[PDB]
Amino acid sequence: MVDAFLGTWKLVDSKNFDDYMKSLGVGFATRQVASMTKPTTIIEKNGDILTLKTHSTFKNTEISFKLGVEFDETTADDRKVKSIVTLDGGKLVHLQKWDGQETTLVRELIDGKLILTLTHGTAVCTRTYEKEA
Numbered sequence: 001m002v003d004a005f006l007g008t009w010k011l012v013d014s015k016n017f018d019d020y021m022k023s024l025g026v027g028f029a030t031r032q033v034a035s036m037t038k039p040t041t042i043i044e045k046n047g048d049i050l051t052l053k054t055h056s057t058f059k060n061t062e063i064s065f066k067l068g069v070e071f072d073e074t075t076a077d078d079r080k081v082k083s084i085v086t087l088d089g090g091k092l093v094h095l096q097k098w099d100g101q102e103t104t105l106v107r108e109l110i111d112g113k114l115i116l117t118l119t120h121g122t123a124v125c126t127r128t129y130e131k132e133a
């Protein structure tokens, strides 16, 4: 089910990340560093617990969760949100809610690449990752 997402992924393309960050109210100086950062995402499992790590020269984050069970999350931009990750049509869908707002982080595998689509408001960012050996 989740197994083809597991591993180490490196950012190879990004579209509209600044628009997504702006929509969330991230400050200009943080957007500016983040626009030049190429993070590594690591996805691991131990039983039914998934861990997702995002490593970079700027910010590092790590979450652990069970699919389909809500968890509290503090995001890289310091939002305190209620999160849930599920599997929907073969995609890993991460929904964050806070203050009546929502954002989705959808991960799909196409041609061996991991495509992350981030939506908040009208902003839609697409980030492409390639799997490390």
Ligand SMILES: Cc1cc(C(C)(C)C)c(O)c(C(C)(C)C)c1
Pocket: 021, 024, 026, 030, 031, 034, 037, 039, 054, 056, 058, 059, 060, 061, 075, 076, 077
């Ligand atoms: C500012 C900022 C915001 C985010 C999200 C909003 C995607 C959570 C982020 O992922 C990053 C790194 C890519 C650097 C981890 C920086």
